[PDB]
Enzyme design. Structure first.
Site, mmCIF file in Angstrom:
data_model
loop_
_atom_site.group_PDB
_atom_site.id
_atom_site.type_symbol
_atom_site.label_atom_id
_atom_site.label_comp_id
_atom_site.label_asym_id
_atom_site.label_seq_id
_atom_site.Cartn_x
_atom_site.Cartn_y
_atom_site.Cartn_z
ATOM 1 N N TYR A 10 31.243 -14.809 33.783
ATOM 2 C CA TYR A 10 29.863 -14.601 34.172
ATOM 3 C C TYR A 10 29.509 -13.130 33.966
ATOM 4 O O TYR A 10 30.387 -12.277 33.843
ATOM 5 C CB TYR A 10 29.631 -15.040 35.626
ATOM 6 C CG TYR A 10 29.889 -13.973 36.667
ATOM 7 C CD1 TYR A 10 28.846 -13.165 37.133
ATOM 8 C CD2 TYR A 10 31.175 -13.742 37.162
ATOM 9 C CE1 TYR A 10 29.076 -12.154 38.055
ATOM 10 C CE2 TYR A 10 31.411 -12.729 38.090
ATOM 11 C CZ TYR A 10 30.356 -11.938 38.524
ATOM 12 O OH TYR A 10 30.587 -10.902 39.397
ATOM 13 N N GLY A 58 45.421 -7.192 32.987
ATOM 14 C CA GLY A 58 46.861 -6.982 32.961
ATOM 15 C C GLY A 58 47.562 -7.234 34.279
ATOM 16 O O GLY A 58 48.612 -7.871 34.313
ATOM 17 N N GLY A 59 46.984 -6.732 35.365
ATOM 18 C CA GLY A 59 47.574 -6.934 36.678
ATOM 19 C C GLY A 59 47.542 -8.398 37.078
ATOM 20 O O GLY A 59 48.501 -8.918 37.656
ATOM 21 N N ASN A 94 28.927 -26.789 37.323
ATOM 22 C CA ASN A 94 29.400 -26.287 36.031
ATOM 23 C C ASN A 94 30.597 -27.084 35.493
ATOM 24 O O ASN A 94 30.780 -27.201 34.280
ATOM 25 C CB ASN A 94 29.801 -24.807 36.133
ATOM 26 C CG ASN A 94 28.730 -23.866 35.599
ATOM 27 O OD1 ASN A 94 27.930 -24.246 34.763
ATOM 28 N ND2 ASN A 94 28.743 -22.620 36.061
ATOM 29 N N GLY A 99 42.785 -4.656 34.737
ATOM 30 C CA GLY A 99 42.316 -5.653 35.683
ATOM 31 C C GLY A 99 42.909 -6.976 35.220
ATOM 32 O O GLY A 99 43.467 -7.739 36.015
ATOM 33 N N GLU A 132 47.190 -23.247 12.302
ATOM 34 C CA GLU A 132 48.045 -23.764 13.375
ATOM 35 C C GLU A 132 47.387 -23.842 14.746
ATOM 36 O O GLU A 132 47.930 -24.466 15.660
ATOM 37 C CB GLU A 132 49.330 -22.934 13.476
ATOM 38 C CG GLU A 132 49.175 -21.606 14.233
ATOM 39 C CD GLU A 132 48.558 -20.478 13.410
ATOM 40 O OE1 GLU A 132 47.968 -20.732 12.332
ATOM 41 O OE2 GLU A 132 48.674 -19.316 13.849
ATOM 42 N N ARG A 137 50.202 -10.449 35.350
ATOM 43 C CA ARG A 137 51.531 -10.252 35.944
ATOM 44 C C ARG A 137 51.691 -11.150 37.167
ATOM 45 O O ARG A 137 52.775 -11.695 37.418
ATOM 46 C CB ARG A 137 51.750 -8.791 36.344
ATOM 47 C CG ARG A 137 51.841 -7.838 35.173
ATOM 48 C CD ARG A 137 52.428 -6.485 35.587
ATOM 49 N NE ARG A 137 51.511 -5.700 36.408
ATOM 50 C CZ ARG A 137 50.500 -4.978 35.931
ATOM 51 N NH1 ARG A 137 50.261 -4.933 34.623
ATOM 52 N NH2 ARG A 137 49.733 -4.283 36.763
ATOM 53 N N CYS A 154 47.536 -14.571 9.631
ATOM 54 C CA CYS A 154 46.956 -13.481 10.415
ATOM 55 C C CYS A 154 47.880 -12.258 10.443
ATOM 56 O O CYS A 154 47.993 -11.551 9.446
ATOM 57 C CB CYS A 154 46.612 -13.923 11.833
ATOM 58 S SG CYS A 154 45.211 -12.996 12.504
ATOM 59 N N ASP A 203 29.393 -24.894 30.090
ATOM 60 C CA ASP A 203 29.409 -24.676 31.533
ATOM 61 C C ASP A 203 30.791 -24.450 32.131
ATOM 62 O O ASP A 203 30.926 -23.881 33.221
ATOM 63 C CB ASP A 203 28.670 -25.806 32.243
ATOM 64 C CG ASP A 203 27.166 -25.769 31.982
ATOM 65 O OD1 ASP A 203 26.583 -24.667 32.057
ATOM 66 O OD2 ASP A 203 26.572 -26.827 31.670
ATOM 67 N N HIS A 247 43.630 -19.012 11.340
ATOM 68 C CA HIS A 247 44.758 -19.695 11.979
ATOM 69 C C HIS A 247 44.729 -21.218 11.875
ATOM 70 O O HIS A 247 44.147 -21.894 12.733
ATOM 71 C CB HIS A 247 44.803 -19.327 13.462
ATOM 72 C CG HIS A 247 45.238 -17.923 13.732
ATOM 73 N ND1 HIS A 247 44.347 -16.909 14.014
ATOM 74 C CD2 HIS A 247 46.472 -17.379 13.839
ATOM 75 C CE1 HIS A 247 45.014 -15.804 14.289
ATOM 76 N NE2 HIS A 247 46.305 -16.062 14.191
HETATM 77 N N1 ADP Z 1 31.764 -11.850 30.986
HETATM 78 C C1 ADP Z 1 31.922 -12.915 30.271
HETATM 79 N N2 ADP Z 1 32.979 -13.090 29.446
HETATM 80 C C2 ADP Z 1 33.204 -14.177 28.689
HETATM 81 N N3 ADP Z 1 32.396 -15.246 28.657
HETATM 82 C C3 ADP Z 1 31.362 -15.060 29.464
HETATM 83 C C4 ADP Z 1 31.032 -13.994 30.273
HETATM 84 N N4 ADP Z 1 29.825 -14.220 30.962
HETATM 85 C C5 ADP Z 1 29.435 -15.413 30.577
HETATM 86 N N5 ADP Z 1 30.309 -15.983 29.675
HETATM 87 C C6 ADP Z 1 30.187 -17.304 29.039
HETATM 88 O O1 ADP Z 1 28.890 -17.400 28.493
HETATM 89 C C7 ADP Z 1 28.324 -18.697 28.691
HETATM 90 C C8 ADP Z 1 26.990 -18.566 29.426
HETATM 91 O O2 ADP Z 1 27.165 -17.794 30.633
HETATM 92 P P1 ADP Z 1 26.249 -18.045 31.902
HETATM 93 O O3 ADP Z 1 24.864 -18.262 31.392
HETATM 94 O O4 ADP Z 1 26.527 -17.042 32.929
HETATM 95 O O5 ADP Z 1 26.764 -19.507 32.356
HETATM 96 P P2 ADP Z 1 26.231 -20.493 33.539
HETATM 97 O O6 ADP Z 1 24.809 -20.249 33.853
HETATM 98 O O7 ADP Z 1 26.565 -21.834 33.024
HETATM 99 O O8 ADP Z 1 27.052 -20.115 34.815
HETATM 100 C C9 ADP Z 1 29.364 -19.521 29.431
HETATM 101 O O9 ADP Z 1 30.058 -20.260 28.443
HETATM 102 C C10 ADP Z 1 30.270 -18.452 30.052
HETATM 103 O O10 ADP Z 1 31.595 -18.825 30.276
HETATM 104 MG MG MG Z 2 26.007 -23.591 33.921
HETATM 105 MG MG MG Z 3 26.687 -19.052 36.581
#
Ligand code: ADP
Ligand code: MG
Ligand code: MG
Ligand code: MG
Length: 1284
Positions: A396, A321-322, A711, A319, A1251, A325, A1124, A668, A1249
């Site tokens: 999310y 990967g595509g 956000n 998902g 750098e 691209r 690393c 956010d 890391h």
């Molecule tokens: N599937 C996910 N992969 C990576 N980061 C995620 C994922 N779901 C949520 N996050 C991160 O976790 C934090 C909290 O998520 P969430 O509570 O859903 O945020 P908000 O309520 O601000 O929309 C945020 O920094 C968000 O980017």
């Molecule tokens: Mg939020």
């Molecule tokens: Mg949200």
């Protein structure tokens, strides 16, 4: 073992023990839970080598050595019954592709293919016939693997099948029945009008259609590819509608074309960026340099819902990967920069951690559970992002599964078919935004890996390293500027080449003649249909002028990126595919026929609208509600989805999910710098509120847009028109009320909200079959998803340094609520309602467009004016969660009064209306309140109270205490979901250690102690002379951290030279001309055969290059650094490095998981010349690895290493003590060791890391007083001064 194998010979080499103690215990415990009396189990990796020629003693020794890797686990003599698990016959694992590349790069061309399996030895003398089948079932993935009874059975994996011929469908001899039979047989899913179209087309041509031709047409005309729903005419409630859904989305571009460079014309949209220094290595000099120019921004978001329901890991990985691209194939070549991830599944129902609102409604046998998706899925997505080399900075995660009285009455609504969303941003050159014209005679090329039968049909396959190699080629191309050889480029996705090539030539107004046998293939038995239509990954199609082919060949060979010219562009708009083997033409069609469209779709639908019932509060109390809500996965801490993915690669990440000294995942939005020399940047945010669609379609859409805005509001952007949106629509088309609901939702944002706000939606996608059906008992069951709009917002950022987070300050402050809900306090479709198994009456919605706009503008004013201390918007969980999360991030208390929010305290605290809480200095409250009023927000703004040092979370209403609890207690409850997820997915000991650490309020968080002046550029006197020493910036295929490493040495005064291993083997570069060398980070060969092993062994086995490195290290004044992947590589080169006899090995982390952390380390006393003046310093650094655990031969080796004084860096907890506790020490390294040097101090290797964090702005958290340089910049300056 060497045995005859077809026209070849197969060698069987037994490997090392495959399972750690906790994994073995997990299996045994699982056997008892199924009543399978297993006394003991042992596992061992086994390698299979298909040889096309003999291996002499030296080569045999080299092969055996190559296959010696991994942690030194407890070895045992095989006992019990053997159960060999291998990839299913007819499939080639990514491990195989990468392991075979290593063999080849080590001079072992005799190795045709290397494959690996796991040999299980089970002692259990009680099991019957079925019981043994149950044991086998617990040891393998039925969708990807098979179980064999003997090692010799592995021969089946290398069977060479003869090329299957093309098959014609006898339309001329049987009539329409032939197309009907083929439609059912091949699963074409052709509509009656499509069958009619094909019948006339071929009757006119006077010949039978070939299966490949019908298949190509069917894929091209699928809902997924043609988007019929989005281009259909509509009739709603008896009234014909003027615009299609696509047309209503396009209305946003017509109203707001501002800053848009490309929209609806490519695989991604492009918006204006900033003029900054693009850093890369010149084609003629090989030297890295900054190129001041506009770095425009591209954006795209896609989904992989169906595949993920069948096989989560590959589904999520491809998902991403595509989508990567699509980014690279934007315009005439571009570069991916950062990514986002999204997941929507049903209830988790974690064993032993069941929640009150969860009920098992069953599911189809053919799909995996929500829990399985959230276990394997995130790992697959992170696996691609980590290995390819792009940070995952936002996303999310929502869980929803409930029997609700919605639009179609009482039904089950949820996500059995999940939403697996992947997107991101990239940078592109101004002159490469528009696709170029395709000249007649242009060479049509396929860039990428060999094809396999992957298009079980829903089980994907990912090889991120192959895509990295391709990206390097694309980068070399756009880096040539006006000399960029790429005339046109497109990604290969759905339909494979059958869709990609016709689309490429068609977009150029040309035709094309192809040769089937010129396409690279990994399975000879494939039919023309399979070769042309398979959905193999990591492939791009492009057009190149014939005179540019030699240059293109040079670029690909240097990167080890496979490619093949498969056709030529023609003036005649005709498609021709020839087969030299069978001497025929599988395809011979005019493009206007193949691409011809059947009559447009017309959807006559009617509106269904749920009534909504008032929330029954009988069992609801504010205290219990708080506890439940913090336990809803959608609301709960997301650490398990964050630390598994790299968040620092590129060195341009300014704001990641983890916030503050306590690294709490509550940011956010994400923010990246546009370059390594600017403060301008890019921001990404997501808005989504699917449950609301179960009550109000338009409201759910408006809220998704609104939340994306709330956000991203605390980032310095300016004009709202700078914010561009990707709208991804998920729905169960055809389900009662969903169609009309979709139209109304699209109209609400495309025709109304966005145009009024000045927001453009220049990109998007749709998934129209979000529903699952199956039979539970004797009755049919269905799980239908709510209409689900996911809005992703992207924007150019004016100053990355001014972004605010939820981290509260305890200085004199005022907490102010901006309630865009205007006191409505809606509770319908909220976390609160869901947690009590209800839907509620009325949901939130955008109450006032002008005020939402005013809110954004007011926030932009406050951000630019530096009047905010913190910001956190309100979404899932409401005000309660907003305040709680701010308290968590700031590690403090809150004292707030909600009397002004209404007499209904439950509604005040849990409504999910738009808005949020800003924290301002107490002395600025009056002025801030005045500013908000100037934007018409006076009645929506409420002073709540203040953040206070301590652990008390208190909510009052006049003299009444509404809710009061320990902030730490809430913090831990909020962390339980990720704790439980980590406990079942990773090493439980580590999961427990991380969770328990959260309960200690005394944790001071990350903190610094420096032994030197961070601002003193000790290299300045040297740089001032203009004399710049060269540094060989070493990289192998798969390395991805070379750009920022070069930028760090550049900052210190070096002339950074791009040195690929192919350059050394080719003689284009000699180490004798260098005084400094650095092995960069990444995933060379995808870490197959052990991280850094293939890279190191390719050096060792090529005597000429081995001598080059040995000579370098043996010189009296040379300096070398390995970071690393480079640290792992150099540790495997000990024999060539003087004073390295005591060096340890670096193996799989104790946690058994990739760790992307911002860890606290301490510089220890050692001979290290690069750490001079830094001894005793304690500061955070970027950690991003899966195999960083220091492993010694025995304690004698550890004691020796320590006594020699070679340890240079150690992980310390926040209290400042050396630790082995997780995650303070992210990998489990003994004595916290993470960097060692040689006896003479001229060579130093480290896992973290430096750098990636040499710039203060790239530090997740850092002291406020720091300037441009972080402590880590000193390493590079030390190197410069040492060389003199
Ligand atoms: N599937 C996910 N992969 C990576 N980061 C995620 C994922 N779901 C949520 N996050 C991160 O976790 C934090 C909290 O998520 P969430 O509570 O859903 O945020 P908000 O309520 O601000 O929309 C945020 O920094 C968000 O980017
Ligand atoms: Mg939020
Ligand atoms: Mg949200
Ligand atoms: Mg949240």
């Amino acid at each position: 073992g060497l045995v005859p194998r077809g026209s070849h010979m197969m060698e069987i080499l037994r490997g090392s023990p495959a399972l750690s103690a906790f994994r073995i215990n997990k299996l045994l415990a699982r056997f008892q839970a199924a009543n399978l009396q297993v006394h003991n189990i042992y596992a061992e990796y086994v390698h299979f080598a298909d040889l096309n020629a003999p291996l002499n003693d030296s080569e045999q020794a080299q092969l055996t050595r190559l296959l010696q890797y991994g942690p030194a686990l407890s070895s045992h003599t095989p006992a019990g019954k053997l159960l060999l698990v291998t990839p299913r016959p007819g499939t080639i694992s990514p491990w195989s592709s990468k392991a075979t590349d290593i063999a080849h790069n080590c001079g072992l061309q005799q190795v045709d293919r290397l494959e690996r399996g796991v040999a299980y030895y089970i002692e259990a003398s009680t099991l019957t016939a079925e019981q043994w089948r149950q044991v086998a079932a617990e040891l393998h993935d039925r969708m990807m693997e098979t179980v064999f009874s003997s090692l010799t059975d592995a021969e089946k994996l290398f069977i060479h099948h003869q090329p299957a011929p093309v098959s014609s469908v006898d339309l001329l001899g049987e009539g329409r029945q032939a197309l009907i039979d083929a439609n059912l047989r091949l699963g074409l899913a052709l509509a009656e009008d499509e069958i009619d179209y094909l019948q006339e087309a071929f009757t006119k041509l006077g010949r039978n259609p070939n299966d490949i031709e019908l298949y190509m047409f069917a894929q091209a005309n699928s809902e997924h590819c043609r988007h019929k729903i989005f281009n259909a005419d509509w009739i709603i409630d008896g009234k014909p509608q003027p615009k299609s859904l696509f047309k209503m989305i396009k209305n946003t571009f017509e109203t707001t074309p501002d800053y848009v460079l490309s929209a609806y014309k490519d695989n991604a949209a492009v918006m204006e960026g900033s003029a900054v220094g693009r850093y890369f290595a010149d084609h003629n000099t090989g030297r890295y340099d900054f190129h001041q120019e506009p770095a425009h921004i591209l954006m795209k978001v896609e989904t992989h819902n169906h595949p993920t329901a069948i096989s989560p890991w590959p589904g999520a990985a491809t998902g991403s990967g595509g989508e990567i691209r699509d980014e690279g194939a934007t315009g005439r070549g571009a570069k991916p920069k950062a990514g986002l991830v999204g997941f929507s599944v049903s209830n988790l129902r974690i064993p032993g951690f069941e929640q009150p609102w969860e009920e098992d409604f069953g599911k189809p046998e053919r799909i995996v559970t929500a829990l399985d998706i959230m276990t394997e899925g995130p790992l697959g997505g992170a696996a691609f992002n980590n290995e390819f080399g792009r940070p995952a900075l936002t996303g999310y995660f929502r869980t929803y599964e409930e029997k609700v009285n919605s639009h179609n009455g009482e039904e089950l609504r949820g996500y059995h078919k999940p939403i697996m969303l992947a997107g991101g941003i990239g940078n592109i050159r101004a002159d490469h935004v528009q696709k170029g014209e395709i000249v007649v005679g242009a060479k049509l090329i396929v860039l990428g890996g060999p094809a396999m039968n992957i298009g079980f049909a829903s089980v994907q396959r990912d090889n991120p390293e192959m895509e990295r190699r391709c990206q390097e080629v694309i980068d070399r191309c756009w880096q040539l500027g006006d000399a960029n050889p790429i005339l046109f480029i497109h990604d290969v996705g759905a339909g494979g080449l059958s869709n990609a090539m016709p689309e490429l030539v068609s977009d150029g107004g040309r035709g094309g003649k192809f040769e089937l046998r010129d396409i690279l293939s990994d399975e000879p038995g494939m039919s023309p249909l399979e070769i042309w239509c398979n959905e193999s990954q990591e492939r791009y199609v492009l057009a190149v002028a014939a005179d540019q082919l030699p240059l293109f060949d040079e670029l690909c060979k240097r990167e080890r990126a496979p490619y093949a010219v498969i056709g030529d562009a023609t003036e005649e708009q005709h498609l021709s595919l020839h087969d030299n083997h069978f001497d025929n033409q599988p395809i011979d069609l005019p493009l206007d026929v193949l691409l011809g469209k059947t009559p447009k779709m017309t959807r006559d639908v009617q509106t269904l609208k749920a009534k909504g019932d008032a929330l029954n509060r009988a069992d609801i109390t504010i205290a219990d509600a708080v506890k439940r809500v913090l336990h809803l996965p959608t609301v709960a801490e997301k650490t398990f989805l964050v630390t598994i993915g790299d968040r620092t690669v590129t060195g341009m990440v300014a704001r990641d999910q983890m916030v503050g000294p306590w690294q709490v995942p509550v940011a956010d939005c994400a923010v990246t710098t546009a370059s390594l020399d600017s403060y301008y940047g890019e921001a990404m945010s997501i808005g989504e509120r699917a449950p609301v669609a179960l009550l109000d379609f338009a409201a759910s859409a408006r809220l998704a847009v609104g939340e994306a805005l709330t956000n991203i509001a605390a980032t310095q952007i300016g004009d709202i028109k700078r914010i561009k949106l990707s709208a991804n629509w998920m729905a169960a088309a055809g389900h009662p009320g969903e169609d009309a609901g979709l139209y109304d939702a699209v109209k609400a944002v495309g025709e109304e909200l966005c145009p009024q706000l000045g927001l453009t939606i220049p990109v998007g996608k749709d998934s129209m079959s979000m529903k699952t059906r199956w039979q539970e008992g004797n009755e049919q069951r269905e799980m239908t998803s709510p209409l689900s709009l996911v809005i992703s917002a992207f924007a150019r950022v004016e100053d990355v340094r001014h972004t605010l987070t939820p981290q509260l300050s305890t200085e004199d402050n005022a907490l102010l609520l901006i309630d865009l809900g205007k006191g409505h306090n809606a509770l319908g479709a909220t976390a609160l309602a869901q947690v009590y198994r209800q839907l509620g009456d009325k949901p939130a919605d955008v109450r006032d467009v002008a005020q939402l706009k005013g809110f954004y503008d007011a926030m932009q004013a406050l951000v630019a004016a530096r009047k905010l201390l913190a910001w956190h918007d309100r979404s899932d969980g409401g005000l309660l969660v907003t305040l709680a999360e701010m308290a968590f991030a700031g590690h403090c208390g809150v004292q707030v009064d909600i009397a002004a929010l209404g007499d209904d305290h439950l509604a005040a605290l849990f409504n999910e209306e738009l808005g949020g809480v800003i924290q301002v200095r107490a002395e600025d409250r009056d002025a801030v309140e005045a500013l908000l009023a100037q934007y018409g927000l006076a009645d929506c703004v409420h002073y709540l109270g203040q953040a206070l040092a301590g652990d008390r979370f208190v909510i009052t209403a006049n003299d009444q205490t509404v809710f009061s609890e320990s902030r730490t207690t809430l913090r831990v409850w909020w962390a339980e979901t990720t704790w439980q997820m980590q406990r079942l997915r990773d090493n439980p000991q580590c999961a427990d250690q991380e969770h328990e650490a959260k309960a200690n309020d005394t944790d001071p968080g990350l903190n610094v102690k420096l032994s030197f002046d961070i601002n003193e550029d000790i290299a300045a006197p040297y740089i001032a002379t203009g004399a710049r020493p060269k540094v060989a910036v070493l990289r192998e295929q798969g390395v991805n951290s070379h750009v920022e490493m070069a930028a760090a040495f550049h900052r210190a005064g070096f002339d950074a030279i791009d040195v690929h291993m192919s350059d050394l083997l080719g003689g284009r570069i000699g180490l004798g001309n260098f005084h400094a060398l650095v092995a960069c980070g990444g995933f060379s060969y995808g870490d197959v055969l052990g991280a850094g092993e293939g890279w190191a062994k390719s050096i060792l086995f090529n005597h000429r290059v081995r001598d080059e490195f040995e000579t370098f290290f043996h010189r009296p004044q040379t300096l070398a650094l390995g970071v690393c992947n480079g640290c792992q590589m150099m540790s495997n080169l000990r024999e060539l490095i003087p004073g390295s006899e005591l060096w340890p090995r670096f193996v799989r982390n104790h946690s058994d998981r990739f760790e992307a952390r911002f860890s606290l380390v301490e510089v220890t006393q050692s001979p290290s010349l690069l750490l001079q003046g830094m001894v005793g310093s304690q500061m955070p650094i970027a950690v991003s690895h899966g195999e960083g655990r220091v492993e010694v031969r025995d304690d004698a080796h550890l004691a020796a290493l320590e006594s020699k004084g070679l340890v240079a860096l150690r992980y310390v907890d926040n209290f400042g003590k050396v630790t082995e506790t997780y995650p303070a020490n992210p990998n489990g390294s003994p004595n916290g060791i993470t960097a060692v040097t040689t006896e003479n101090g001229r060579v130093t290797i480290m896992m973290p890391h430096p750098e990636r964090v040499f710039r203060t702005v790239a530090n997740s958290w850092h002291p406020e007083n720091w300037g441009e340089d972080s402590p880590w910049m000193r390493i590079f300056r030390n190197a410069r001064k040492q060389l003199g």
